[PDB]
Short mmCIF file of C-alpha atoms and ligand atoms in Angstrom, two decimals:
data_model
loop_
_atom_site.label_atom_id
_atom_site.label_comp_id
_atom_site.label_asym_id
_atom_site.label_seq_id
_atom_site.Cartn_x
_atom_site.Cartn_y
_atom_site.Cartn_z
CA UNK A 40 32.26 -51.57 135.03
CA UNK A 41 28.93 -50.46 136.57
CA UNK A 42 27.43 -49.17 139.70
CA UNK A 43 30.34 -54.53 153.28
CA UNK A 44 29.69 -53.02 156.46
CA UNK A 45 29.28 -55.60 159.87
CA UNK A 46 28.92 -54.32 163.20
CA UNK A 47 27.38 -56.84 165.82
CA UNK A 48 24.36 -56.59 166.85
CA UNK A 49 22.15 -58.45 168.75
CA UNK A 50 20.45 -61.17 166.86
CA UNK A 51 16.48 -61.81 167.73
CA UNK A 52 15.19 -65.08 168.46
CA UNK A 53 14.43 -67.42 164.82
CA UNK A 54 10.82 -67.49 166.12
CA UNK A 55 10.17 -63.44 165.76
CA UNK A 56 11.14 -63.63 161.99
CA UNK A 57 9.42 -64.39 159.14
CA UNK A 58 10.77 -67.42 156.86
CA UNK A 59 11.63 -65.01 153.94
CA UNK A 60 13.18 -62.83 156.30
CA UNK A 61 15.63 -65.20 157.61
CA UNK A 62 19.28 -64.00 156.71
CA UNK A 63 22.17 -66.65 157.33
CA UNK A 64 24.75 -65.01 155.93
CA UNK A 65 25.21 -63.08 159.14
CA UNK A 66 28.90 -63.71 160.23
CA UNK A 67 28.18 -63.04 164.02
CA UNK A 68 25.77 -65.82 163.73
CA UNK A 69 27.69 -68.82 164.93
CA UNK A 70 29.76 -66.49 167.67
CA UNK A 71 26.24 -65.99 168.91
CA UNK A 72 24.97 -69.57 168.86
CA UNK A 73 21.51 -68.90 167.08
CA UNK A 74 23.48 -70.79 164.37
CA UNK A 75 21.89 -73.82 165.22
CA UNK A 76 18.04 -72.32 165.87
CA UNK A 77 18.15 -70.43 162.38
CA UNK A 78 19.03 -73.78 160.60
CA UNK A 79 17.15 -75.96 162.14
CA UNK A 80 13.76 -73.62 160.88
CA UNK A 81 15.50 -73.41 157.75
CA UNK A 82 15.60 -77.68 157.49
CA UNK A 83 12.20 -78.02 158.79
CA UNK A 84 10.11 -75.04 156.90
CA UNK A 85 12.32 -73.98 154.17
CA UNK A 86 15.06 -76.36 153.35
CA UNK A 87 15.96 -74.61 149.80
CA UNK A 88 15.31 -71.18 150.99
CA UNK A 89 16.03 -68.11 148.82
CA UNK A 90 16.71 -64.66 150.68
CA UNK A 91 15.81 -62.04 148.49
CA UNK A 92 17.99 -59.26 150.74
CA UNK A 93 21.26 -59.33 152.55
CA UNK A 94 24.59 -57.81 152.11
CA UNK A 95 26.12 -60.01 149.79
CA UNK A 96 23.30 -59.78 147.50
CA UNK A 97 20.48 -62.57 147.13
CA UNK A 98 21.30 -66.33 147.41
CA UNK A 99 19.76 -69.85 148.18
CA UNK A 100 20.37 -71.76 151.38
CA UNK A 101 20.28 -75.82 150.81
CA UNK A 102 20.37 -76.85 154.75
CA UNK A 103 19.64 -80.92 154.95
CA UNK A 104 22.21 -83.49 154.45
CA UNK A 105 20.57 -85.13 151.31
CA UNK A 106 19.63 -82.03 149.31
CA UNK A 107 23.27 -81.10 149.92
CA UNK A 108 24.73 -83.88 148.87
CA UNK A 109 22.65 -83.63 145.35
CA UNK A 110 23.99 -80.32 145.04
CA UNK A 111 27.64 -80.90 145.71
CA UNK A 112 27.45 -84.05 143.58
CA UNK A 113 25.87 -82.40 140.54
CA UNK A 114 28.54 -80.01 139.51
CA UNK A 115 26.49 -80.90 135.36
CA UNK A 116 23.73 -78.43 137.67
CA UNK A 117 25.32 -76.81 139.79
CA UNK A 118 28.68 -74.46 138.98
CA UNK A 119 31.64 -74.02 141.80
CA UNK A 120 32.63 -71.40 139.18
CA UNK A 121 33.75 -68.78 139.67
CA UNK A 122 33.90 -68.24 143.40
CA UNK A 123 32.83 -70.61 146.40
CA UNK A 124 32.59 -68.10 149.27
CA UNK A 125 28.92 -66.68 149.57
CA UNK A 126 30.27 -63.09 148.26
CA UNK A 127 32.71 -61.38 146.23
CA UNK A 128 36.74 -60.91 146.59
CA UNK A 129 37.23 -57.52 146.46
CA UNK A 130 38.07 -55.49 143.23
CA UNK A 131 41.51 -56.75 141.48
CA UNK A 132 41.98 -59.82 144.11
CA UNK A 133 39.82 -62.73 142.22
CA UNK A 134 42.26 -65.63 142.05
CA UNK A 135 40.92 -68.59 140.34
CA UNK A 136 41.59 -71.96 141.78
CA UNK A 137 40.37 -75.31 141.54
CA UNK A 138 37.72 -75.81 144.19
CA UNK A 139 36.32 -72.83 142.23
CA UNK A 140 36.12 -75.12 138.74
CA UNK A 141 34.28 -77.83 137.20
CA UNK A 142 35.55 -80.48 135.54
CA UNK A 143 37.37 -80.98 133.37
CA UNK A 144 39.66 -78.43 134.16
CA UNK A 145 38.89 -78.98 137.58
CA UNK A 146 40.29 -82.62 137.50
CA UNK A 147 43.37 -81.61 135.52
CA UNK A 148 44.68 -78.97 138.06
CA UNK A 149 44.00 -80.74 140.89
CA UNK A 150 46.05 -84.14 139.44
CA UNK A 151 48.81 -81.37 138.76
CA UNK A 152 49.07 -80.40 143.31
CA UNK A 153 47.29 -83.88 144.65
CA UNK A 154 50.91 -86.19 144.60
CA UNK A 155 51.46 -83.33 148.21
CA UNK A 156 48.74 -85.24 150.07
CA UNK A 157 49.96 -88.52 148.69
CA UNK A 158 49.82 -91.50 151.35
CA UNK A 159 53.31 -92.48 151.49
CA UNK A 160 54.38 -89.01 151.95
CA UNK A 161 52.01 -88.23 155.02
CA UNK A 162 53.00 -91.59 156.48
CA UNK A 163 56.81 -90.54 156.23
CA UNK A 164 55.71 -87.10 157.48
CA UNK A 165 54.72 -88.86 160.79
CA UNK A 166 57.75 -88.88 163.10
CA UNK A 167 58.19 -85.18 162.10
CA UNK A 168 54.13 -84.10 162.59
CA UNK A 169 54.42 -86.47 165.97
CA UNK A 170 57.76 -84.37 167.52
CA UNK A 171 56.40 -81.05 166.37
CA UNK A 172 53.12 -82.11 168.53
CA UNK A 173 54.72 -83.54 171.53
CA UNK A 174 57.30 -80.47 171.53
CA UNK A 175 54.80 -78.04 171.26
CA UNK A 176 52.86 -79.41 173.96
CA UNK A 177 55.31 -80.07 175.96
CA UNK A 178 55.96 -76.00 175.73
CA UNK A 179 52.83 -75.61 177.62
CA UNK A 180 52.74 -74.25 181.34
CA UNK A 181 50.84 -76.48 183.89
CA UNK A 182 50.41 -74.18 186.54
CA UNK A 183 48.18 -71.44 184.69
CA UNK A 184 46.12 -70.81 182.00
CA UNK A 185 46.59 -70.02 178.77
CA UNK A 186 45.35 -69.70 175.10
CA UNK A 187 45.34 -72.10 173.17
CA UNK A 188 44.88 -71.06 170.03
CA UNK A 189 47.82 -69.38 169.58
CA UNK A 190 49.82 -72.14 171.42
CA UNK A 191 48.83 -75.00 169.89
CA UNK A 192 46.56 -75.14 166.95
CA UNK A 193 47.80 -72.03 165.31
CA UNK A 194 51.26 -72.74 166.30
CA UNK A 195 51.33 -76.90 164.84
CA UNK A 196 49.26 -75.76 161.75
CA UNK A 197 52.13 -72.67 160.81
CA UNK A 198 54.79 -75.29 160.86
CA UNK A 199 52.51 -78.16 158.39
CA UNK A 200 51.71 -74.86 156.20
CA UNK A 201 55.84 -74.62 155.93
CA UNK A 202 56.46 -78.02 155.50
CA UNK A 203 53.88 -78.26 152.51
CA UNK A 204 55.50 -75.49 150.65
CA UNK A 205 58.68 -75.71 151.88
CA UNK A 206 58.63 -72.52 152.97
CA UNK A 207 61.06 -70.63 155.10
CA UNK A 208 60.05 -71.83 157.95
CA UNK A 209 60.84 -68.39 159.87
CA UNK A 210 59.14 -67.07 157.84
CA UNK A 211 55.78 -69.79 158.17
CA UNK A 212 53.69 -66.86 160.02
CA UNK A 213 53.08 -65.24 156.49
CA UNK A 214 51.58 -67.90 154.98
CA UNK A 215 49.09 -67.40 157.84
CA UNK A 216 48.36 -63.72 157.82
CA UNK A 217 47.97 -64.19 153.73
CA UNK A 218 45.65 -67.22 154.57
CA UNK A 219 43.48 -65.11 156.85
CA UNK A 220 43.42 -62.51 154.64
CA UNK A 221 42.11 -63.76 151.88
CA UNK A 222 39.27 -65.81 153.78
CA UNK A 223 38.61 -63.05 155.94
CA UNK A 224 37.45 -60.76 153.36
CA UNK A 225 34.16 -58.83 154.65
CA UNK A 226 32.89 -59.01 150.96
CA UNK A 227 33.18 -62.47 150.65
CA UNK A 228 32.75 -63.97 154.03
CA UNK A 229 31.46 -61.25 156.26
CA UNK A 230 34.86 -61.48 157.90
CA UNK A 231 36.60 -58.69 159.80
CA UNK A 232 39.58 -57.76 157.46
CA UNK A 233 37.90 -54.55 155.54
CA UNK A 234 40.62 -52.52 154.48
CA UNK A 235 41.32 -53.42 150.56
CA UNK A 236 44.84 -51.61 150.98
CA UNK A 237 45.96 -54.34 153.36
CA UNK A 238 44.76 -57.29 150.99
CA UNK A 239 46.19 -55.16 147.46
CA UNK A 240 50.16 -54.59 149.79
CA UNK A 241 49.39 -58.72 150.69
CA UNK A 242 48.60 -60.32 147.24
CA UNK A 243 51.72 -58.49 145.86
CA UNK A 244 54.21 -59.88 149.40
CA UNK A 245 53.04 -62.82 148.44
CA UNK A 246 53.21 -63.15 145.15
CA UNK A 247 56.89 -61.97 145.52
CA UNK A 248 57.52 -64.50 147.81
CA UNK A 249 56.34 -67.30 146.25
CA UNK A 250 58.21 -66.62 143.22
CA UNK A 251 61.72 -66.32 144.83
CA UNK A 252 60.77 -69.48 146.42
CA UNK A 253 60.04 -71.02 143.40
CA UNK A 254 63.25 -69.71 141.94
CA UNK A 255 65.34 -70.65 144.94
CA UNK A 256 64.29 -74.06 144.75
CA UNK A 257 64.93 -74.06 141.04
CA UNK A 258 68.50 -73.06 141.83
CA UNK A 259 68.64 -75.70 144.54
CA UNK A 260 67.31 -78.15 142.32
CA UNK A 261 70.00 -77.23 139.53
CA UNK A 262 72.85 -77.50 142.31
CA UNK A 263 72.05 -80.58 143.14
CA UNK A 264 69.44 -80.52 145.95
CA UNK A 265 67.66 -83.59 146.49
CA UNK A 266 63.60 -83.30 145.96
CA UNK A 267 61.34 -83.32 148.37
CA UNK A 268 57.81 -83.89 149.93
CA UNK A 269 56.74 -80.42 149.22
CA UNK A 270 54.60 -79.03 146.59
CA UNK A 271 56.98 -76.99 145.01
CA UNK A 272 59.29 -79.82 144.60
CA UNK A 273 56.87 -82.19 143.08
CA UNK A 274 55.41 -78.95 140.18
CA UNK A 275 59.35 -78.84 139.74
CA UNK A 276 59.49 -82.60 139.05
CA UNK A 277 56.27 -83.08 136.30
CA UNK A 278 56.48 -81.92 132.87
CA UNK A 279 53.50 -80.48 133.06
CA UNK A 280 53.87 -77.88 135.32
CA UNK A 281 58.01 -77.65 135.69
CA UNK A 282 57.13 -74.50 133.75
CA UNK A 283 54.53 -73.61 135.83
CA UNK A 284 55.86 -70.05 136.71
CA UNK A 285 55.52 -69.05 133.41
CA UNK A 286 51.35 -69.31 134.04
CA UNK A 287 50.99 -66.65 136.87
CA UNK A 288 47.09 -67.26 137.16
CA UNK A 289 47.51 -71.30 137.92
CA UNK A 290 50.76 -70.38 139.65
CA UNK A 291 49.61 -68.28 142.21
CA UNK A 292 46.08 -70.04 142.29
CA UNK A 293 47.84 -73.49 143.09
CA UNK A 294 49.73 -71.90 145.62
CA UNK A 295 47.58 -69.67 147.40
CA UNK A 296 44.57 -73.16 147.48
CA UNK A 297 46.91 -75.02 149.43
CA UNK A 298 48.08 -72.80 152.06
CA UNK A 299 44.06 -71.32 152.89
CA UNK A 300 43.27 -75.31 152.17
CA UNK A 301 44.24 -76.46 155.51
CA UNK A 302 44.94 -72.84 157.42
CA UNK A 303 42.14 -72.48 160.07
CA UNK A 304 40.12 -75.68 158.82
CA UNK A 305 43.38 -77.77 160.94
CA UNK A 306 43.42 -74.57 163.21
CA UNK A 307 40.13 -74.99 164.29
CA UNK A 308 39.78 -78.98 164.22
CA UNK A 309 42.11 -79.09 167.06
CA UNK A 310 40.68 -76.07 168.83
CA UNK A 311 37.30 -77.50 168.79
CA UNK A 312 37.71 -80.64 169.86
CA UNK A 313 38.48 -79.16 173.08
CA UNK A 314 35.27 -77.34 173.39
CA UNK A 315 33.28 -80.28 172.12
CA UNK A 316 34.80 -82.14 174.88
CA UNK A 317 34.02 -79.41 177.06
CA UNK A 318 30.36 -79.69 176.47
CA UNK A 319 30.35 -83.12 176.53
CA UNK A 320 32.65 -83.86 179.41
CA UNK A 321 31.73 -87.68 179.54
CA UNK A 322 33.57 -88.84 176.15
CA UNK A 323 37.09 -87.52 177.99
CA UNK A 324 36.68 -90.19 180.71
CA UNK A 325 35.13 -92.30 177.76
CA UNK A 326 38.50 -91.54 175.68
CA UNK A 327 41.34 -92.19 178.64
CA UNK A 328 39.16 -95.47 179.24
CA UNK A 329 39.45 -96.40 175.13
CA UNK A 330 41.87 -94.70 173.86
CA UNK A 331 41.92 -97.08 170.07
CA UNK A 332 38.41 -94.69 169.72
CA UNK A 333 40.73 -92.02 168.55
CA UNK A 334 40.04 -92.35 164.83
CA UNK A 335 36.49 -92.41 165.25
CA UNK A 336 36.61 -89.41 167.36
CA UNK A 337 38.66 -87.49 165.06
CA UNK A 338 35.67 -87.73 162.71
CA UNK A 339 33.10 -86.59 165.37
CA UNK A 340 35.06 -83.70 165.88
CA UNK A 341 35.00 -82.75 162.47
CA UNK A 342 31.35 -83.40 162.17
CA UNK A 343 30.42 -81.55 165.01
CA UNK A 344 32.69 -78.31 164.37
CA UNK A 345 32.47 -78.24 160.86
CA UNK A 346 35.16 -75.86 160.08
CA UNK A 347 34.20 -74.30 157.06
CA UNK A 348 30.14 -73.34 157.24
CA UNK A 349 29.31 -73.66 153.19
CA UNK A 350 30.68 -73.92 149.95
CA UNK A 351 28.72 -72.07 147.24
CA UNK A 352 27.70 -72.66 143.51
CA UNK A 353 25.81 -71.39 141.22
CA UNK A 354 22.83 -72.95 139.32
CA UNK A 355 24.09 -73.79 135.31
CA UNK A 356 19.72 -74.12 134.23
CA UNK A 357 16.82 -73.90 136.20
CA UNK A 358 16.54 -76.76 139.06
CA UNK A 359 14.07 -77.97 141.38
CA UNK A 360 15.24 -79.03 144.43
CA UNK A 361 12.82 -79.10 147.89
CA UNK A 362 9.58 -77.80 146.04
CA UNK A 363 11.01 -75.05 144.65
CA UNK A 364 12.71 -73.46 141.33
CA UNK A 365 16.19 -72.33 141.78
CA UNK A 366 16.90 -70.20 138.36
CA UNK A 367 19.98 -70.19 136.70
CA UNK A 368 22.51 -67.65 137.67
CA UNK A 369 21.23 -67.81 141.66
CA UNK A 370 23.78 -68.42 144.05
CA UNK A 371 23.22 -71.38 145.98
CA UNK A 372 24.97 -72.48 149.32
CA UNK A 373 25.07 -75.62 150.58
CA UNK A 374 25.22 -75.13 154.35
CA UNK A 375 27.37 -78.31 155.43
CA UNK A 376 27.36 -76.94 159.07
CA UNK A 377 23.51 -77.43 158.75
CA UNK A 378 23.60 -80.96 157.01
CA UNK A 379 26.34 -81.98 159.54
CA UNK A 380 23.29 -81.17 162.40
CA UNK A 381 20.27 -82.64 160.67
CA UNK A 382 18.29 -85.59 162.50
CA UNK A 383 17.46 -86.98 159.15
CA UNK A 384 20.83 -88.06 158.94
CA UNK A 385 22.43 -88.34 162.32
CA UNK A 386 20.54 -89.16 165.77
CA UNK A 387 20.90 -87.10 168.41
CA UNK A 388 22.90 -84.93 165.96
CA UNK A 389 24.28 -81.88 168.33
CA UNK A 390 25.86 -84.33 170.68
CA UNK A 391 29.57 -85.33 170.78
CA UNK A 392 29.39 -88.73 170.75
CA UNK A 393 33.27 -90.54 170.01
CA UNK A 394 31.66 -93.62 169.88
CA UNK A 395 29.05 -92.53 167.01
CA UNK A 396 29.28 -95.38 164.53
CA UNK A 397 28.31 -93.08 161.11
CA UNK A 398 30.63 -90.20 162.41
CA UNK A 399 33.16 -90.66 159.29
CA UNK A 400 29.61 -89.86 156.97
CA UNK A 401 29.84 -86.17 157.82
CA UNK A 402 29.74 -83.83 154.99
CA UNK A 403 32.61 -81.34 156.53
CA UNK A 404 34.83 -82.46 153.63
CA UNK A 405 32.02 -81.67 151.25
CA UNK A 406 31.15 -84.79 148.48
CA UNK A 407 31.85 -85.03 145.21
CA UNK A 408 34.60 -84.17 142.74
CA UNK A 409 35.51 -81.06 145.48
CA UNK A 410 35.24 -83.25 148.44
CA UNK A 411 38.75 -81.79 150.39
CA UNK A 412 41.87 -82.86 149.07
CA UNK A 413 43.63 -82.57 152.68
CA UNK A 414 40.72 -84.98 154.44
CA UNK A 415 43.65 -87.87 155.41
CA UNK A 416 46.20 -84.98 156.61
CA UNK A 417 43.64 -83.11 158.62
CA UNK A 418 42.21 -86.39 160.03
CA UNK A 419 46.39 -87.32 161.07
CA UNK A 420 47.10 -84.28 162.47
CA UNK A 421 44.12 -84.58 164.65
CA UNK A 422 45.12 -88.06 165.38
CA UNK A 423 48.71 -87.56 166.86
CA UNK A 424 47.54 -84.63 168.45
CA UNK A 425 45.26 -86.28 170.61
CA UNK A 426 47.46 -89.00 171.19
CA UNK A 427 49.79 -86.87 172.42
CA UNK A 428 47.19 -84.95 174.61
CA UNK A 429 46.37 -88.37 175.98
CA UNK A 430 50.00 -89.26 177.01
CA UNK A 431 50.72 -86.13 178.93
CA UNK A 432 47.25 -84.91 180.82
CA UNK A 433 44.73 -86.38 183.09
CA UNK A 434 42.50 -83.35 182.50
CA UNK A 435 41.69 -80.23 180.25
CA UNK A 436 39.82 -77.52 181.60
CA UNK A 437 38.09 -74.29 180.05
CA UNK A 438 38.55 -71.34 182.35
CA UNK A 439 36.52 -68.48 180.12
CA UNK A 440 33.59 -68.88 177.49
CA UNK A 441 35.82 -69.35 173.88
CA UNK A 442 36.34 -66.08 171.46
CA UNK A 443 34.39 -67.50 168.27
CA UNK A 444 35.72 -65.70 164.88
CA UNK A 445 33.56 -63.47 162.48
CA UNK A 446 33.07 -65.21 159.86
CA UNK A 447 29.88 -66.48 157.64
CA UNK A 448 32.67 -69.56 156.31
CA UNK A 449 34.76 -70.41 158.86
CA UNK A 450 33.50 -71.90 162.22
CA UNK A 451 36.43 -71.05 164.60
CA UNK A 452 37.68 -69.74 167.82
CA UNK A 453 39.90 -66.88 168.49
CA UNK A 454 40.32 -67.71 172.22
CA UNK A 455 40.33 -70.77 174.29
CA UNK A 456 41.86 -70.38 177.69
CA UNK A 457 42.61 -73.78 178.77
CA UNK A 458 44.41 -74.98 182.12
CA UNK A 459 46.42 -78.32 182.14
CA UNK A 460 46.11 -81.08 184.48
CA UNK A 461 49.18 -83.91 183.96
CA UNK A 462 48.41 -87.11 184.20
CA UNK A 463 50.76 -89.04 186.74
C1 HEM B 737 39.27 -80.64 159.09
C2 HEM B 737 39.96 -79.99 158.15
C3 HEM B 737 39.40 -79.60 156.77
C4 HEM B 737 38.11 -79.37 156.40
C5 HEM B 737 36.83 -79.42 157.25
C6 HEM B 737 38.13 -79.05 155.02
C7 HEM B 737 37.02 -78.77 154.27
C8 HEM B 737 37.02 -78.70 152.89
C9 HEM B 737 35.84 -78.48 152.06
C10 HEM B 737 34.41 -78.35 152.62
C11 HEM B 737 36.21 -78.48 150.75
C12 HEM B 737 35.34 -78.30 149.49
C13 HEM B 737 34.31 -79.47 149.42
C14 HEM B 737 33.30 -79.32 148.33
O1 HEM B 737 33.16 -78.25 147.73
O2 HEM B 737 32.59 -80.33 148.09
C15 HEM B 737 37.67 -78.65 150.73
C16 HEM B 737 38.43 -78.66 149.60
C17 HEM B 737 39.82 -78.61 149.59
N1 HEM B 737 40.63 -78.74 150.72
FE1 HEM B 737 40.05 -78.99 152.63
N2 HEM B 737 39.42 -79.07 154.56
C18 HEM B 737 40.24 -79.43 155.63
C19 HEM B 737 41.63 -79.58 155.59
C20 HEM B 737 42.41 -79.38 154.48
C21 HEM B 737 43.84 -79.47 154.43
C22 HEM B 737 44.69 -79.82 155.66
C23 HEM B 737 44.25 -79.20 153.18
C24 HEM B 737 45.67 -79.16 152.59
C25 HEM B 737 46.71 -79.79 153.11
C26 HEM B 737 43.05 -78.99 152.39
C27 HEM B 737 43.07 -78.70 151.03
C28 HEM B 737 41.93 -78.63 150.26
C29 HEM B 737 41.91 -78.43 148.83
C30 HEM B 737 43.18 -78.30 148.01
C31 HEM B 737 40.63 -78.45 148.42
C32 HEM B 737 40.01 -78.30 147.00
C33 HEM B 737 39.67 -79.72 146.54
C34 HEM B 737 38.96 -79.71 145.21
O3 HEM B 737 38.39 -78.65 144.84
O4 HEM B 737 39.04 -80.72 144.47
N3 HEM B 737 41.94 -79.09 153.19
N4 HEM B 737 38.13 -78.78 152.06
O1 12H B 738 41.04 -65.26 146.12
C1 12H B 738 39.85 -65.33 145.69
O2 12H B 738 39.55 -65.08 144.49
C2 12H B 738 38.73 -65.72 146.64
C3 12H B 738 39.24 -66.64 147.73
C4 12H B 738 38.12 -66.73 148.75
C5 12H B 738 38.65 -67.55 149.90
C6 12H B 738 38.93 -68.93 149.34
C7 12H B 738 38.59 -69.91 150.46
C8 12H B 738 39.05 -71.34 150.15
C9 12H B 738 39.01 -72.20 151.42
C10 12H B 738 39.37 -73.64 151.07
C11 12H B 738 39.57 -74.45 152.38
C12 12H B 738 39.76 -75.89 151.85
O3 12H B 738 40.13 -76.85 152.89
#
């Protein structure tokens, strides 16, 4: 009922701009590194900042740590409903899912999917996430270069995507394109994927698939299969949603949450920890020296990457926040890769530091009732993956400026061309 395009081009210094006419929704914006310049004016002149003009229509930026955290926190103010990218998914794609609701119905679907991510499952989960690590980087040549992404972080988080699901696991590269799909949407995200034919032949694939997966594991069930770990095992298991087929919205919504859930968020965790480590050469030789600082560092490399830019809500009333009236129905977007920079919360804030005693405060799980389901598996797959780096190589090298992905939500690399050095 009633009444898009992104080509790169070069993007002028913050200073030639006027506040009002500061955009960042731009998804070449981060690839270009006047990410960090453009939010830092934002935090110190305009910290709730509404842009009257940009592609995705108008919206409010919320850029320091504690007006953030008010907003994510206040879902009684501020709506996740109906969508939390910055835009739109295209016409006949909206799925709804639960980091897109407010409580209550919020709290209900995610009790139905959360047992996935219990503790005593990831913990069991261990031996196989530690051999799929080792193996994988074992796999790696040590007498040239070669990129990373593909080899390693795309590669170990295809096979956790499978094992969450239970999914064929020849078939775990799906899951993937589906994933990148959907959060790659140029309406939504600024991303590159354009062509609405490719996302309608997708949704359908995929909701195919997932239903004869459900069904074959309803027929293994009724055979006699044992249950497992996996999500589809565990809705098969509750009275509450062994029916769950039957509700194709939650069905599909469920689904479809978990598999973008921790697609290029884990992808790009364990890509840039490399380049963080790049920058900051001094915490490798810090690491080899104390290698128990792992934990800790896992959290500064989610802090400083922040893999996903924003989540967005929309104002339920009229609110001031930062000296100004947001009215309802605005779009506001809480800029976590902003908060996770501002000196108000963290000295020296666009250093790598391992060692940083408040890294594990970082707001790139979010806060509040959304705050990311997967934070302890993303935080153990980092952890055996660098325990695994530090077992096998005495040095990591860089060999070519990274590929950084188009994208206004996701903070992530497309190429990282990395030569090995083994240890010993
Ligand atoms: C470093 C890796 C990850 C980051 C940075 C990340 C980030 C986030 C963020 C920012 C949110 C929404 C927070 C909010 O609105 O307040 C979220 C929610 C969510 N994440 Fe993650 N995520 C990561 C890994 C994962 C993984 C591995 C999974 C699944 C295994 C996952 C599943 C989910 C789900 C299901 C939600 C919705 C939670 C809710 O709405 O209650 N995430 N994540
Ligand atoms: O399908 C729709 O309706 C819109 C989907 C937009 C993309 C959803 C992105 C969710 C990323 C969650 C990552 C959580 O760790």
């Amino acid at each position: 009922f009633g009444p898009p395009e992104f080509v790169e081009t070069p993007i002028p210094d913050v200073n030639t701009l006027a506040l009002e006419d500061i955009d960042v929704s731009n998804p070449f914006l981060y690839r270009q590194g006047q990410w960090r310049a453009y939010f830092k004016r934002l935090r110190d002149e305009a910290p709730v900042h509404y842009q009257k003009n940009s592609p995705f229509g108008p919206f409010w930026s919320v850029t320091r740590f504690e007006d953030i955290l008010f907003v994510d926190k206040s879902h009684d103010l501020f709506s996740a409903e109906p969508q939390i990218i910055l835009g739109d998914p295209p016409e006949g794609l909206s799925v709804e899912m639960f980091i897109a609701m407010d409580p209550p119905k919020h709290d209900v679907q995610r009790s139905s999917v959360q047992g996935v991510v219990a503790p005593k499952n990831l913990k069991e989960m261990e031996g196989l996430i530690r051999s799929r690590t080792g193996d994988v980087l074992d796999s790696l040549p040590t007498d040239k270069p070669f990129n990373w992404v593909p080899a390693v972080s795309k590669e170990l988080t295809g096979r956790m995507l499978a094992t969450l699901l239970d999914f064929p696991y020849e078939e775990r590269h799906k899951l993937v394109e589906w994933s990148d799909r959907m959060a790659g949407a140029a309406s939504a995200t600024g991303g590159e994927f354009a062509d609405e034919n490719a996302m309608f032949d997708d949704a359908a694939d995929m909701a195919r698939s997932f239903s004869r997966l459900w069904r074959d594991k309803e027929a293994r069930r009724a055979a006699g299969e044992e249950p497992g770990f996996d999500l589809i095992s565990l809705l098969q298991s509750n009275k509450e949603t062994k029916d769950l087929i039957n509700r194709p919205m939650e069905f599909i919504g469920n689904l479809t949450l978990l598999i973008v859930g921790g697609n290029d968020t884990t992808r790009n965790s364990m890509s840039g920890g490399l380049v963080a480590m790049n920058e900051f050469p001094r915490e490798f030789e810090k690491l080899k020296a104390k290698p128990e600082l792992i934990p800790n560092m896992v959290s500064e490399i989610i802090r400083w990457q922040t893999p996903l830019a924003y989540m967005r809500r929309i104002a339920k009333q009229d609110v001031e926040l930062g000296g100004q009236t947001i009215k309802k129905g605005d779009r506001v977007v809480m800029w976590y890769a902003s908060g996770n920079r501002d000196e108000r919360k963290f000295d020296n804030p666009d250093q790598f530091i391992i060692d940083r005693k408040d890294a594990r405060n970082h707001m790139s799980f979010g806060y509040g009732v959304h705050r990311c389901m997967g934070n302890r598996l993303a935080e153990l797959q980092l952890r055996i993956l660098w325990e695994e780096i530090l077992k096998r190589f005495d040095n990591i090298e860089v060999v070519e400026e990274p590929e950084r992905v188009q994208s206004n939500f996701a903070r992530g690399y497309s190429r990282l061309m990395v030569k090995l050095t083994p240890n010993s």
